[PDB]
Design a protein around this ligand. Structure first.
Ligand SMILES: O=c1[nH]cc(F)c(=O)[nH]1
Ligand SMILES: O=c1[nH]cc(F)c(=O)[nH]1
Lengths: 287, 286
């Protein structure tokens, strides 16, 4: 545990815009067993609204006025956004895991409901990550702490992934549910092998050798935070999974050509699976 | 210029929610000579609104409604947010610099208006970066492209920095303006030497040895995107500066203990200086 936290009279959650004196954390958050996250404040809000409807229950922002992130709560589930990229995700992760610790919450499941680029699967596919790796296909998150290199192993809650897959096989979703590996990259364009950024120093041949090699190593999609979420939660005593929809088949192209409406439809598909899971696993109270 | 863009009949700006077919880019953006950016959509909008008032001109969002980023324009200035951290900033950088390319804009100045942790300066101090380095004080942005390590030199437009410093002396700011080095970190907590994250593997003494050393190497503040902005712009034919206020003295602590109201006042100080600069040098029409 971080003993330095005891030195504080009050802990200011800078990016959520509240402090430990804002509410009673044990009373307020003590019953939380799940945290659902994604890059979009609007989308995670909508998801929380859907969970409230399922709970038979407005879903009001718990975060303060000038916060970078939103925070909602529906029964035993916390909802937060985390922007895009490992650094932004680590800001959310630090402050939410502190919150959870202060509330007395242990062994919480974090669920990332994101969007991603697919490898060898159709757009709209749900990929359940069975491992999260960097762009060198290594299951580690890399950090530089006090100027020194550190690596933290990525651990996916595989027992839960398998339960979700089994669940999906018994459901009627309008998409395939693929279990496979997930590359987290530190950019949307060049690090993801895109030819269509403002800069590109490689050929299509080199792009496809990179992506096809990843495919052969079991990778089925690519996003920007996976290695942060699945390394940090384990180290703070929690569990984590990634449930991402694909928005493009990167073996065919780079551009996101589907409509805004179609993208929104696709992005809601992880929530449709996960929502029923949460319902069956005491995420909400069925009223 | 990326030759592969000519392989697109249409170029979708995914995170801005429009396309090359959405506008006549030459007609709409051709006059842009400045891009002001920061992590907050609300704060960059308020700054654009302030520049609009200066120009004597509602500032409407140009980006799509379901977009990750906002985009505004006041005369020759473009405004956008970029979230927090290098990956997010790179997303804005690629799409905005493509936009400028399509619009025929050349030698544009990117201005990041951020907040930061200070080293040995008082909270509310404006730091003008005269270099942007990683946590090892190296003037490079690091990338892993097709799984291979790539480094890109950071280049701050120093001529503009010097002009800003000189300008600030002639203004009446309630703060000091310091030219100094800026560290970009891939985290707010552990990578910035904070003792107050959910994980900490070091002591107060190890924190202070690390930051005091950086101070001695001329670092005066610390944020999360400097190396991306100052390496990317140069390589795409543009210029870039960082103008960041400090919200805490990291040699004294980690927590941001100033009120939300004071933080907001502080966060507006970069725009106050930069706006005077843009007003003098053809950012707007008065
Ligand atoms: O990080 C990503 N998010 C969403 C995508 F569609 C993609 O290709 N990459
Ligand atoms: O990246 C940062 N932004 C703002 C701060 F106050 C800080 O310490 N670090």
């Amino acid at each position: 545990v971080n003993s330095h936290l005891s030195e504080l009279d009050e802990d200011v959650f800078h990016h959520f815009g509240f402090t430990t004196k804002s509410f009673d954390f044990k009373e307020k958050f003590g019953d939380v067993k799940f945290v659902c996250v994604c890059g979009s404040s609007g989308r995670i809000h909508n998801f929380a609204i859907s969970m409230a409807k399922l709970a038979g229950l407005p879903v009001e922002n718990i975060a303060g006025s000038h916060a970078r992130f939103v925070l909602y709560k529906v029964d035993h589930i916390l909802f937060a956004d985390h922007g895009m990229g490992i650094p932004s995700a680590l800001i959310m992760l630090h402050e939410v895991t502190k919150l959870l610790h202060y509330a007395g919450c242990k062994d919480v499941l974090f669920i990332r409901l994101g969007t991603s680029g697919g490898l060898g699967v159709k757009p709209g596919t749900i990929v359940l990550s069975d491992r999260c790796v960097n762009t060198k296909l290594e299951p580690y998150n890399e950090l530089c702490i006090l100027g020194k290199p550190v690596r933290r192993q990525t651990i996916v809650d595989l027992n839960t992934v398998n339960e979700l897959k089994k669940l999906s096989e018994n459901l009627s979703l309008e998409c395939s549910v693929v279990v496979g590996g997930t590359i987290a990259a530190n950019d949307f364009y060049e690090e993801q092998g895109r030819l269509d950024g403002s800069i590109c120093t490689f050929s299509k041949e080199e792009k496809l050798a990179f992506l096809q090699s990843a495919y052969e190593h079991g990778i089925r999609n690519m996003e920007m935070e996976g290695t942060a979420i699945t390394s940090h939660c384990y180290l703070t005593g929690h569990r984590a999974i990634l449930v991402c929809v694909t928005a493009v088949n990167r073996l065919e192209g780079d551009q996101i050509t589907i409509s805004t409406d179609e993208f929104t439809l696709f992005a809601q598909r992880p929530g449709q699976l996960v929502g029923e899971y949460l319902k069956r696993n005491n995420g909400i109270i069925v009223r």
